[PDB]
Amino acid sequence: ASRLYTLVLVLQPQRVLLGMKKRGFGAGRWNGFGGKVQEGETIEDGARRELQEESGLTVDALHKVGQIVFEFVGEPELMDVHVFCTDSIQGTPVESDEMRPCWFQLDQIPFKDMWPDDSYWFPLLLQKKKFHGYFKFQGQDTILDYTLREVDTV
Amino acid sequence: ASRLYTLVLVLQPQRVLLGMKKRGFGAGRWNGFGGKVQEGETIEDGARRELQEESGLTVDALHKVGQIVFEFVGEPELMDVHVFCTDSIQGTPVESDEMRPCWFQLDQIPFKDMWPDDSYWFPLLLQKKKFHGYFKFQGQDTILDYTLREVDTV
Ligand SMILES: [Cl-]
């Protein structure tokens, strides 16, 4: 019923890395880095792979910070998104044909040009709180219903 | 935007009192006792009044146990239901033209003939947990969406 995805936020003391998607699903929005988890690959390894593929950064330690389930009206498959954070990275962000990474000061996170669910859970991530969320969408821009709570265990 | 209601459950160690509504809103279902809160009356006093009016019982102490907000699609006014419990009552339940009270053993609560939200929050009430809930209904029988959580403070 659900498909596994990862989402990685590089969050440092005063700034966070986001990527502008240049084409495809979510073009024109800023977001974290991630994608589908592969056959035979752990969710964490998938998260590391996708951060490295999409941003050009090398990550050692990833930390589990959340789980978000997305439901899209009209679509049978739910998205089961495992959210991770890291402070410690190597390399510098790389712009590719698919993604333009940029650093944002924490007071200047571009919520109006991010997925609408981010306005709910990002503030939790910034204060190092872990969460479980569920968002029902109609299209890409409208949240019909949601739940969100803080958790001790992701 | 919301209208105040009360709902009172008489919960003793091995049994709970419910009333079968004989006519009007909710006829044919078992439920707790309550109704609208009046001008100039506290919510607790409203709860005591309605228990006494509908069941014939006299209650001294009522305990706050929950808050449930109901939304009915097509209806502008939300219902803000303040839920109370008591163990200590006086008198014996009285059947009237409006209501038939009956005691139920805790393993025989008639959930299939109660409002559907009760299946979610009643088990919390039985284990002396306090809660906040929200239920979106289409008609009387269908929960479209809900949230429910345990709270320290009602
Ligand atoms: Cl919900």
UniProtKB/Swiss-Prot annotation, chains A, B:
Changing W115Y: Enhances 2-oxo-dATPase activity and greatly reduces 8-oxo-dGTPase activity. Changing R149A: Reduces 2-oxo-dATPase and 8-oxo-dGTPase activities and increases thermolability. Inhibited by 2-oxo-dADP and 8-oxo-dGDP. N(6)-methyl-AMP binds at T6, K21, W115, P116, D117, D118. 8-oxo-dGTP binds at T6, K21, N31, F33, G34, G35, K36, W115, P116, D117, D118. Changing Q52P: Loss of activity. Changing G35F: Loss of activity. It comes from the Eukaryota. This is Oxidized purine nucleoside triphosphate hydrolase. It comes from Homo sapiens.
